[PDB]
Amino acid sequence: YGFQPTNGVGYQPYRVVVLSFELLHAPATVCGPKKSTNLVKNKCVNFNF
Amino acid sequence: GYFKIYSKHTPINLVRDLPQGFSALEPLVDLPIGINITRFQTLLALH
Numbered sequence: 254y255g256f257q258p259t260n261g262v263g264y265q266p267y268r269v270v271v272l273s274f275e276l277l278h279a280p281a282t283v284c285g286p287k288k289s290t291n292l293v294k295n296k297c298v299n300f301n302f
Numbered sequence: 303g304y305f306k307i308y309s310k311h312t313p314i315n316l317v318r319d320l321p322q323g324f325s326a327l328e329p330l331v332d333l334p335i336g337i338n339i340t341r342f343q344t345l346l347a348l349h
């Protein structure tokens with residue numbers, strides 16, 4: 254590579270990471286953290302435990 | 303595809319040298335390996 258200190262925009266090296274997600278090819282192992290909430294007592298409230 | 307192992311260690315000394323009695327087993331490890339295995343061996347130690 255030909256790079257110089259402040260040589261422009263197209264010559265400045267950039268860090269690039271490519272992420273490929275595999276789905277339905279195996280049991281699910283990686284997941285995103287779902288937001289939870291506080292519980293209630295003695296109230297008619299539906300639940301999703 | 304799920305490989306699950308149940309274990310029980312505590313013995314029952316009801317009789318001598320034969321496994322009389324019964325007791326339940328509870329799972330310890332579950333592995334989503336997903337591939338079948340038809341043959342297996344065991345590892346021992348000699349002297």
Ligand SMILES: *[C@@H]1O[C@H](CO)[C@@H](O[C@@H]2O[C@H](CO)[C@@H](O)[C@H](O)[C@H]2NC(C)=O)[C@H](O)[C@H]1NC(C)=O
Pocket residue numbers: 336337338
């Ligand atoms: C478990 O057994 C199944 C079928 O008895 C095997 O399934 C085949 O796997 C190959 C992978 O190379 C596929 O190309 C075939 O289409 C599959 N056939 C069927 C009928 O499912 C499998 O290879 C065995 N071993 C494992 C899953 O580790």
